[PDB]
Design a protein around this nucleic acid. Sequence first.
RNA 1: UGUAA
Lengths: 79, 78, 197, 195
Amino acid sequence: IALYIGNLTWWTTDEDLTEAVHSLGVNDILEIKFFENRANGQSKGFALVGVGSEASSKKLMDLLPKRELHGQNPVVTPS
Amino acid sequence: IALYIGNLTWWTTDEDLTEAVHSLGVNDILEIKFFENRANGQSKGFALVGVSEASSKKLMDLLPKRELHGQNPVVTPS
Amino acid sequence: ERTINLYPLTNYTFGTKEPLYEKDSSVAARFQRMREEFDKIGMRRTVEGVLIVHEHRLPHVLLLQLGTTFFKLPGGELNPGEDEVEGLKRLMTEILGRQDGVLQDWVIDDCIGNWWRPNFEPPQYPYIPAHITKPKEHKKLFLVQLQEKALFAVPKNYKLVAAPLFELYDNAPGYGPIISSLPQLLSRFNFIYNLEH
Amino acid sequence: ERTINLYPLTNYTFGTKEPLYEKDSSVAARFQRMREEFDKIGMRRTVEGVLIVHEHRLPHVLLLQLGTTFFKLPGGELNPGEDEVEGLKRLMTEILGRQDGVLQDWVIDDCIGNWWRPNFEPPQYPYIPAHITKPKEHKKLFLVQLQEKALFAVPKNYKLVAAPLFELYDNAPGYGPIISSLPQLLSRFNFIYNL
RNA sequence: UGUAA
């Protein structure tokens, strides 16, 4: 259900992430909350992502670190 | 020779103070240094003026009796 | 080079009118209505006016006070479709417009800033962070030129204060990031400090 | 109301040229020259230019570095009697001008701020304090519109950074109060991000 | 700057 997607560049958008998830087959996206530097609004390079399936969780943990986002492979973690 | 001048408003300028002395009859002022807040630049309300001994006793005697911006100055030695 | 005339605070008379209350009663309800409206009309569009006077040859910004600690500029959220300048004039009259039959025209010409709110949260910034594609609020600031003499009507709940620039400068804990960053933005203008009489 | 065209950082080539050392070596040496010049010429008039590019759909501000700690904008002192805008183009070409021979005309158009210095000390403010009638230095900031492509030449004692606005915003300990306060002033422009 | 309004 809940996953940390990390190793993101600070210019990786919510569109960028949504487009990469959907390309993996996971449609069950429930929420995307970016963790950001409060003082200046910059992204800290990781987000919390809610999915609806254990199949979606599995695909995201296996196939997402494989592809590249703006020159950087993400690191997926449980929670 | 040094003299502290207080009770000034934050909009009392160097000009305003210079004339006030030149009205008292002291044409030997060295330098005026205002005491100011570092964060915003606002005057704290007092300054230090470099002065002759005749010009010093005069200003400590005669200055507080001439108001600036509705306020009477306060004089003190260094 | 933009040349603005400033006049002393006393050139302006401040009357009173009936209280005006905010659509929101709490901070939590404020973000609640924002969330609801974002799904209806999308991004909120806000405008505010910077009325400038002077005392002792130093620029002063007129703020509306609510209590002891909360200050704001006059303005508010635009109705959908409404032009930014016309909407501000409307919003101005509602807050500070005189109550009698003579017209008070607003000279609103110069834009001084843009502020974006990336989430349904307090933080605002003078830019959109590179990872944000759908801001939640877009604020806009205009300089309002006051004429030589003017009459205003302040709602009973509010109070009107002239805040000197040095009071605002580097004082975010006092006034917030926007209001406290006004002196820097306002420095491009060449002000003439006109005297009374 | 104001349209400014920004282009990718990669549209610009940065080269090198021979060092251009500052007129004074120390902090004490620069405040003494200010004191000496003030008595003869009066208030110092400084103009600086803000060159804006973009990367990752965010405006970046080109700054020059001397240490690992000190950053500044391209600019400097006006010669007495010299026009503000005319003098900035002189200083701009002095600092970032190409040695190519090819014409590089600077487009300076919009004033973005004014900074005054009450005493012969570091503190600068964006207004003249009520009790000051003759400030020691008046620094004027202008926005400089760049061509789609350009070649600059950086003196070797300098290095050129493209700092994004968030690294600047609210960061006075990192950039000083003038450079750190740029985002706010800059926000009134409608920036086009040409790809 | 947030209901102490």
